[PDB]
Amino acid sequence: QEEDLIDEDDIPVRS
Amino acid sequence: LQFSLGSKINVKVGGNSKGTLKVLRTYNVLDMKNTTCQDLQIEVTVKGHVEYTMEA
Amino acid sequence: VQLVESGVQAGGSLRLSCVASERTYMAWFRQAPGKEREFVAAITSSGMMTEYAPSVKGRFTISRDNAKNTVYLQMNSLKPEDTAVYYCAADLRQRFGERVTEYDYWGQGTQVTVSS
Amino acid sequence: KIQIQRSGHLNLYLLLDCSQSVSENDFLIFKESASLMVDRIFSFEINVSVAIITFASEPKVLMSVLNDNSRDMTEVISSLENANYKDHENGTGTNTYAALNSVYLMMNNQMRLLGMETMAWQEIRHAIILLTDGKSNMGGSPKTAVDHIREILNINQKRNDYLDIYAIGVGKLDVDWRELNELGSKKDGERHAFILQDTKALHQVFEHMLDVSKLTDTICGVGNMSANASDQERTPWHVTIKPKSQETCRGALISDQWV
Amino acid sequence: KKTFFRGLESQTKLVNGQSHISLSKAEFQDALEKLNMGITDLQGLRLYVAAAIIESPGGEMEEAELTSWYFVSSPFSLDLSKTKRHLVPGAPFLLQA
Amino acid sequence: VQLRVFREFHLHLRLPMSVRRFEQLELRPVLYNYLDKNLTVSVHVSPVEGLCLAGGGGLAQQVLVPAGSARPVAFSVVPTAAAAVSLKVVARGSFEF
Amino acid sequence: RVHYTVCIWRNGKVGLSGMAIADVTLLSGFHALRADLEKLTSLSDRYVSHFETEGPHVLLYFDSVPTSRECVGFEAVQEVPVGLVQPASATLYDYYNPERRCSVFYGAPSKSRLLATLCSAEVCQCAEGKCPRQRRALERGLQDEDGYRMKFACYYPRVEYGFQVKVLREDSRAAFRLFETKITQVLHFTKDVKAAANQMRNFLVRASCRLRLEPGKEYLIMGLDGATYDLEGHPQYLLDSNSWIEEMPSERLCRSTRQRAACAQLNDFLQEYGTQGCQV
Ligand SMILES: *[C@@H]1O[C@H](CO)[C@@H](O)[C@H](O)[C@H]1NC(C)=O
Ligand SMILES: *[C@@H]1O[C@H](CO)[C@@H](O)[C@H](O)[C@H]1NC(C)=O
Ligand SMILES: *[C@@H]1O[C@H](CO)[C@@H](O)[C@H](O)[C@H]1NC(C)=O
Ligand SMILES: *[C@@H]1O[C@H](CO)[C@@H](O)[C@H](O)[C@H]1NC(C)=O
Ligand SMILES: *[C@@H]1O[C@H](CO)[C@@H](O)[C@H](O)[C@H]1NC(C)=O
Ligand SMILES: *[C@@H]1O[C@H](CO)[C@@H](O)[C@H](O)[C@H]1NC(C)=O
Ligand SMILES: [Mg+2]
C-alpha cells in the first residue's frame, strides 16, 4: 500500500 | 401587514364597504414523517475484507 | 450454457475439473445420499477471490484458467466422511456467495467415493 | 450589540472574576479595563444603570442597579476602586453560576419593585459583561443560569436586542477559549467571546461593541475612537468650503445650520 | 398536457461536453402507431424533450426543457403588417413583407 | 461584460438548503483537478463544536486524483447544534506541487 | 478485492412504474472493474441496460424493476487505504421523475450502517473516540506522589463529575455495553441535583471498545458529563477518552512497598476532593 506525509503551513481559506 | 400578538385579538371594523379578512398563524408541530422509503426501496450489502490505516 | 465435469483411499489428494462454455463463476456443491445438497466453496468470475465452507477451511482451493475456461479444485488431505456427488453450477448475475440454492442449470455431477 | 439610544434605559452588569487563578495584578488590569468601560458608556449621556459584582466562590454585589447611585458616574467609579483582591480570601475557587444567580435575584427584585406590565421594565435593554479566564470548576454549569435569565426577560427572536452577554479574557491569563464561547453565545454574526492582551485592544473592541447610530441627540465632540473608522467619522464637524476663488478652505460645524 | 413515449429513452455518455441524439423515421412512426395518434394529427403539437444528465463522480443532476419545438408544414413565416391597406388609385401600390 | 473568474484547482460544496436536526447527513466534498500531473492529497474536516464528525476529529483521508478528473470523498456528519454551525474543510497538498 | 451486491425492488401499483437509475457510491479509494460490468451488460438476459464507472462512483440503469427480491452484484478493487470508518451512500431515482428518490446507507462488512450515538431523547449526543483508559497506576511504574490528580480534575483536561461506583452487572444494548451499577460515594458533580448514595446510574461504552470492567468490584470513575438520561430519570454517563477510571486497592494491596505512601495519597485525594472540591 501507499502512504505519505503532507505539508500544510497555511492555505488561504475561502468563505 | 406583520404583527406580533400571541394572544386573543380584537377587531373594530368600520366602513361602508364589505370584504373578507383572514388571518394566518405559522408554527412548528410534532413531526410524524417516516424516515423509511415508501415507494421504491434500495438496500446494498458489501461483503469481503477491507484494508484500513492505523485506527482503533 | 452447459456444464461438463470429469475426474479412493482416505487422506489423499484429488482433482476434479468442471468446464463451462461461458466464462462464469461456477461454484461447487455436494449432496450425500439421504440428505439435502450443500456447498463446499465458490469463486468469482475474475478468480482472484474465493470462499470456503467452514468445515473445509484452509484445506481446499479453487483456481480458474483464463484460456481453457475451467476451474481447478484440489482435494489434498481427503476426509473419510467427504463422499458425495459434487456438482458445478452457476448463474448469470454475479451474485457471489449465494449460499441458498438459487443457482440455475446445475451440472450433472460426478460421484466420488472415499475408502478408509 | 449594545444599542446606544435615548429611548429606554440601559443596564450594564459587570462581573469580576476574583479567583486565585487570576492573580492580583490581573485583577488590577480588570479594574483598569472596567474603569475605561464605564467611562465610555457614560460619555454618551444616556439612561444607563451600572452594577458591579466580584466573585471567586460567592458573589459580592459591590453595587446594585436597584440603588439610585447606579446611574451616578462618581459612585460607580468609587465602588469600582473600592474592590479589593483579598475580599475573596476565604473562598478562592471559581463560581460563575453564583454570579449569574445573583444577577437573576437582582432582576427579580427589580421587576418586583417596578412592575411586570409597567413600561419601566419593558423599555430596558440589559447587557452583562464577563471579564474572566472562564475556567469554572464548581457551582454548576453557567449555561443553565444563562437560560434561566432568558425566560425572566422572555428572550426569543423578537426580543433579541434586549439581552447581550459577553465573556472576554484580558491580561496575562491562561484563557480557556472553549469556556468563553458558551457564556458568550454568538448572536447573528457578532462575536461575544474575545481573547485580548491589554486594555487598549479591549478599548477598540468595545468601540465596536456599541451601536451609537440609534440616537440622534447629537451632542458635540462625539467623534470616533477607532483607527478602523473613516476620517470623517473621526472628525464629524470637519466641513469643506469652496469660494469662487477656486481655492479650498475648511470649516467646522457648530450647530445644525452654522459654520 | 404531457404525453410521454415508451421505449424511446436514450442513454449516452458525454464526450467533451457534447453529445448528438437522433431518432430514425421508422422508430418515430412505430411510436406514433403504438400511441395511435396519427402522423396527420401533428398540426400544432409540440415535441417534448427532457434531459436528466447526471455528472459523475459528483452524483448531482439537473433538468432541461425543449418546449419550443413545433410541428409545422412550412419552414418560413410571413409578416404582412408593414404593408399598408387602403390602396390609392393612379399611383404604384407598394407591398411590404 | 463577462468577468470570468476561475481557479485552476478547487473544491466545490453544495450543502442542502434544509437539514433536519438529529437526522443523518451525507456530505460530499468533490475534488476538481484540471492540472497535468496526478495529485495525491489529503481531505479532512476541521473538528468543530456542535457537530459529530464521522471520524469524530481531525482524521485525514488519502486519495489520488488523476489529471483532468474528479474524486469525491463521502462524509457522514449528523448535526447536533441549535441553529447554525460553521464548517470548513481542508484539502492539503503534497510536496510535489 | 471487495465484492458488492446492490439490490432493488419496487412496491408497485402506485403509477410511478418504469425504469430506475442507481447511484451506488463505493468507499474512498475504490473503483469497480470495467470488465465485470461489461460482462454483466453483454448477456442477452440483461439486467444492466447501461453502466458507467469513474473511480468510486458507479451508475446502474435498470430497464425493469422487479417487485420481489431480484438483484445483481459485482466486484471492486482498492488502491488507497481508507483513512476512517464511516457508512457510505446509495440512491435510486425514478427515471421519469427524479424528485421521488430513495437514499439508503450502508457500511463496512464488519461495521454498522449508522454512527454510534446515544441521544434517544430531546438532546442528542454522539460517542466516537477511544473508550478504555484501563489505568492502574499502582501496579505499574508511572504513579507519582506529586499529586497531579487535582491538576487533572480541576485544571487540565478538566473533569466535571465525581463518583466512586461499585459494579453490579455487565449489559449490552445496540453497539454499547451497559454497566448497571450502584453508587458508593458521590465525590463531585456539576448538574445532578438528585445525586446521593445507593442510587441507580448507568455507564455506557461501545462494544468495539475493548474496556474490561468486572462486575462486583468498586471502581473510581471520573469524566465529562452526559446529556442522555435514563428511562427512569437518572442521567446516564458515557465512557470515552478523557475519562478517568481506576480500581482502588485493598489493605493487603495498600500496605505493600511498591505502592506504599501512594495508595494512602490516593485515598487522601479522594477524601479531600469529596469534601473541599475544586479550587482556584
Ligand atoms: C380608518 O382610520 C381613519 C384615520 O383617519 C379614520 O378616520 C377612519 O374612520 C377609518 N376608516 C373607516 C373607513 O372607518
Ligand atoms: C418504513 O417503511 C417500511 C416500508 O414501507 C415500513 O416497513 C416501516 O415500518 C416504515 N417505518 C416507519 C417508521 O413507518
Ligand atoms: C433619562 O430618563 C429620565 C427620566 O427618568 C429623563 O429625564 C432623561 O431625559 C433621560 N435621558 C438621559 C439622562 O439621557
Ligand atoms: C482595525 O484594523 C486592523 C488592521 O486591519 C485590524 O487588525 C483590527 O482588528 C481592526 N479592528 C480593531 C478593533 O482594532
Ligand atoms: C464609530 O465606529 C464604530 C466602529 O465599530 C461604529 O460602531 C460606530 O457607529 C461609529 N460611531 C460614530 C459616531 O461614527
Ligand atoms: C496518472 O495515472 C495514469 C494511470 O494510468 C498514468 O498513465 C499517468 O501517466 C499518470 N500521470 C502522471 C502525470 O503521473
Ligand atoms: Mg479561577
Q: Please report, in angstroms and rounded to a whole number, the separation of the first and last CA atoms in chain D.
A: 34
- Ligand 2 midpoint to CA B34 (Å): 7
Distances (CA, A) of B27 to B30, D51, G4: 10, 39, 45
D94 carries a ligand binding annotation: yes
Cα separation, F92 vs G51, whole angstroms:
33
- Count CB neighbours of F86 within 10 A: 12
Name every residue whose Cβ is closer than 8 Å to that of residue D179 and which is 6 or more positions away in sequence.
Answer: D133, D134, D135, D136, D167
Q: Which residues line ligand 3 (CB under 6 A)?
A: D 45-47
Residue among E66, F79, C94 at smallest CA distance from G6: C94
Backbone angles phi, psi at G88, to 5 degrees: -110, -175
How many residues does the structure list for chain B? 56
Q: Which residues pair with G75 in a beta bridge?
A: G3
Residue with cell 461495521: G111
Contact D72, D41 (CB under 8 A): no
Beta bridge partners of C110: C86
Ligand 2: residues within 6 Å at CB? B 34, 36, 38
Give the list of residues 6+ apart from residue F26 with CB closer than 8 angstroms, or none: F74, F75, F76, G89, G103, G105
Q: Which residue of F has its CA nearest to G90?
A: F26
- DSSP string over chain B: ------S--------SS-----------------SS-SSEEEEEEEEE---B-S--
Three-state secondary-structure class, residue D67: coil
State the cell numbers at D28: 488590577
Residue G257 contacts by C-beta under 8 Å, 6 or more apart in sequence? none
The C-alpha cell that represents D170 in the structure block: 484580558
Does the annotation list D21 as a binding residue? yes
Burial of B35 (0-12, 13-18, 19+ CB in 10 A): exposed
In angstroms, the CA G233 to CA G194 distance is 10
Q: Which three cell numbers stand for residue G204?
A: 455506557
Query: Are G95 and E52 inside 8 Å of each other by CB?
Result: yes
Contact G80 F64 (CB under 8 A): yes
Candidates F92, F97, F18, F90; CA nearest to F53 is F90
Question: What is the distance between the alpha carbons of residues E26 and B23, in angstroms, rounded to a whole number?
Answer: 60
Most ligand 6 atoms within 8 A of CB, residue of F33, F38, F65 to mutate: F38
Q: Are the C-beta atoms of G5 and C95 separated by less than 8 Å?
A: yes
Method in brief:
cryo-EM
CB G73 within 8 A of CB C94: yes
Cβ–Cβ < 8 Å for F93, A6: yes
Q: Are there at least 3 beta-carbon pairs closer than 8 Å between A and E?
A: no
Who's near D137: CB < 8 A, 6+ residues apart? D93, D94, G154, G158, G277, G278, G279, G280
CB contact under 8 A, B47 and C97: yes
CA G243 from centre of chain: 15
What DSSP letter does each residue of D29-57 carry, written as one string? HHHHHHHHHHHHHHTT---EEEEEEEESS
Cα(D26) to ligand 7 centroid in Å equals 12
List pocket residues of ligand 5, CB cut-off 6 Å: D 207-208, 210, 212-213, 222, 224, 226, 228-229, 233
F52–G86 CB contact, under 8 Å: no
SS3 annotation, chain C: CCEEEECCECCCCCEEEEEECCCCCCEEEEECCCCCCEEEEEECCCCCCEEECHHHCCCCEEEECCCCCEEEEECCCCCCCCCEEEEEEECCCCCCCCCCCCCECCCCCEEECCEC
H or E, element range at G154: helix G149-154
Which three cell numbers, joined as nine digits, stand for D150? 432568558
> Distance (Å, rounded) from C-alpha E68 to C-alpha G30?
43
Cα G248 to Cα G138: distance, rounded to the nearest angstrom:
9
Rg (CA), chain E: 22
Backbone angles phi, psi at G273, to 5 degrees: -70, -35
Is the distance from CB of G58 to CB of G83 less than 8 angstroms? no
Long-range contacts of residues G140-146, Cβ cutoff 8 Å, at least 24 apart: G143/G259, G143/G262, G144/G262, G145/G261, G145/G262, G145/G265
Amino acid of residue A6? I
Contacts G46 to C, Cβ<8 Å: none
- Burial (CB < 10 A; 0-12, 13-18, 19+), residue G90, is buried
Grid cell locating E52: 436528466
Distance in angstroms (rounded) separating the CA atoms of residues D3 and E79: 67
Could you identify the atom of ligand 3 that is nearest to the CA of residue D45? 14
Residue of F nearest to B54 (CA): F59
Put simply, whether G46 touches D (Cβ < 8 Å) is no
DSSP state of G113: S
D178 Cα–ligand 1 center, Å: 57
Atom of ligand 4 at shortest distance to CA of D204? 13
Q: What's chain A's Rg over C-alpha atoms?
A: 12
Burial bucket for residue C62 (CB in 10 Å: 0-12, 13-18, 19+): buried
- Nearest Cα to F27, choosing from F69, F80, F87, F83? F87
Chain B contact partners (≥3 CB pairs within 8 A)? C, F, G
Q: For residue G223, what are the CA distances in angstroms to D153, E4, G131, G244, G273?
A: 34, 64, 11, 6, 14
CB of B19 shorter than 6 A to ligand 1: no
| CB half-sphere exposure, D162, CA atoms < 13 A | 16
Q: Grid cell 408497485 — which residue?
A: G12
Contact yes or no for C92 and G74 at CB 8 A: no
User: How far apart, in whole angstroms, are the C-alpha atoms of residue D254 and residue G77?
Assistant: 81
Give the Cα separation of G87 and B50 in Å (integer): 13
Q: Do G128 and F22 touch (CB under 8 A)?
A: no
Which subunits sit against G, judged by 3+ Cβ pairs under 8 A? A, B, C, D, E, F
Question: Is residue C44 within 8 angstroms of chain G, CB to CB?
Answer: yes
What distance in Å separates the CA atoms of residue C43 and residue G10, rounded to the nearest whole number?
30
- Rounded to 10 deg, the angle between the D142-153 and D96-114 helix axes is 10
Strand partners, G7: B43
Name the grid cell of D38.
464605564
Task: Pick the residue from chain G with its C-alpha nearest to E5.
Answer: G96
User: Hey, what amino acid is at D238?
Assistant: H
Q: Whose CA is nearest to atom 10 of ligand 4?
A: D228
Q: Quick check: D23 contacting G, CB < 8 Å?
A: no
Q: Which H/E stretch holds residue F71?
A: strand F69-72
User: Resolution of the experimental model in angstroms, please?
Assistant: 4.3
Neighbours of F75 (CB within 10 A): 22
Residue G170 to residue D19: CA distance in whole angstroms: 42
Could you give the CA distance from residue D166 to residue D181 in angstroms, rounded to a whole number? 9
C95 touches chain G (CB under 8 A): yes
Q: Name the packing angle between helices D24-42 and D199-207 (round to 10°).
A: 30
For residue D130, report the distance from its CA to the centre of ligand 7, in Å: 13
According to DSSP, the residues that pair with E11 across neighbouring strands are: none
Q: What angle do CA G138, G141, G142 make, to 5 degrees?
A: 90
**What are the cell numbers at F91?**
484539502
Cα separation, D120 vs D138, whole angstroms: 36
Minimum Cα–Cα distance from A15: chain F residue: F88
The number of C-alpha atoms within 13 Å of D29 and in the hemisphere containing its C-beta is 22
What is the spatial distance between Cα C7 and Cα C14, in angstroms, rounded to a whole number? 9
Rounded Cα–Cα distance for residues G130 and G30 (Å): 27
Using an 8 Å Cβ cutoff, are D65 and D51 in contact? yes
The answer to whether the beta carbons of residues D52 and D80 sit under 8 Å apart is yes
Q: What's the CA gap between G50 and G42, in Å, rounded?
A: 10
How far is C105 from C116, CA to CA, in rounded Å?
A: 34
